[PDB]
Symmetry: D2
Subunit: 115 residues, 4 copies
């Protein structure tokens, strides 16, 4: 699993469940091509987005559909979504965990990159 | 001053100075149109991006060029930029402060919205 | 104004108003001595806690009463308070801004230190 | 495992390894009594601090020794430690994960409380 996404809810103190996540890869024509997507599990995690073979170096974007999550909870949010844009770089074996902590008017995101 | 951006550096405990910021507005053709740009000051703030007249209702994207900021400080960071996407002025004009707190592998963003 | 505290609410996207703040200084007998206190203003800021003369080198604790803030808004939060503990003025006088961003089950704190 | 602690490093994008963590329970004399402690693992986690039998309702404090972690890395930090203070409440079965994200001049903490 070279790429996983973990989302937490800072209002409820819980995993953020059933959040849609879309991953895009930047293409030569400077456009964003859909790459993978899914919904977070009961643990707020999304595994199995890609494989080591497919996840080559390049620029990627992870869009987390935060507005629809807060709307389901009946809480007015600020952002349309949270966008995490980064370059995947081969420098020995790597696993990328994109973590996001959500509040209605704020989010934080971190990358945990391990061997 | 209906739109202000404030950027802080969590490594040095200081304003993040000379950070480039680009603002876009979503146009009718589902494309991002350039709206305003600038660089943060010695206080880590960017004022004067727009006026109440020009800042109509719409979906806006504030792109903070964090990668160039870290690289100039000798750090190879994770993110290409911090992107903040939101609907503005949909219930009438508001004043928006978009704050971002930067670390090499993490950032947080917050909005302070006043009437 | 060598010590200022700023508190924001990540649920409402607003300053956190009327938040009680207590500052303590560690004394020679390994105890916390009361140093200053106050409440945040309409801008979520608390100024005038101390003077350059009184704010000597030492270990200080800034306790932000977040539980009372959330309870007054109808939320039963996780934390009793947000505690910020730090050594001040050990390399000469500095100006400190202690910022806190609050959510019911999370908070972040940052320091902006200037010469 | 009713209480675990997870610590991440926002400068390196990694788990924060070998961080000392001390847990205290508030006693009737309004003093903090040592309850449990340990060091985070290679995954930045600390498990096995307490048991369901011992972890009764009360006020607890989790101290994360952030200053010594940054000193080991040769980076000047702001805080002496990060302190997370909360009330444990029995309202059906609960597991508490205290997560902390560290930067030299900032930290965020979240509680993930699950059944």
């Amino acid at each position: 699993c070279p790429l996983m996404v973990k989302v937490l809810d800072a209002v409820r103190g819980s995993p953020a469940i059933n959040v849609a996540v879309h991953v895009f890869r930047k293409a030569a024509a400077d456009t964003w091509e859909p790459f993978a997507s899914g919904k977070t599990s009961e643990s707020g995690e999304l595994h199995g987005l890609t494989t080591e073979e497919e996840f080559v170096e390049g620029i990627y974007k992870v869009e987390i559909d935060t507005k629809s999550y807060w709307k389901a909870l009946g809480i007015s949010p600020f952002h349309e979504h949270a966008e995490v844009v980064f370059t995947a770089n081969d420098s020995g074996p790597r696993r990328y965990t994109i973590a996001a902590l959500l509040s209605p008017y704020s989010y934080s995101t971190t990358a945990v990159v391990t061997n």
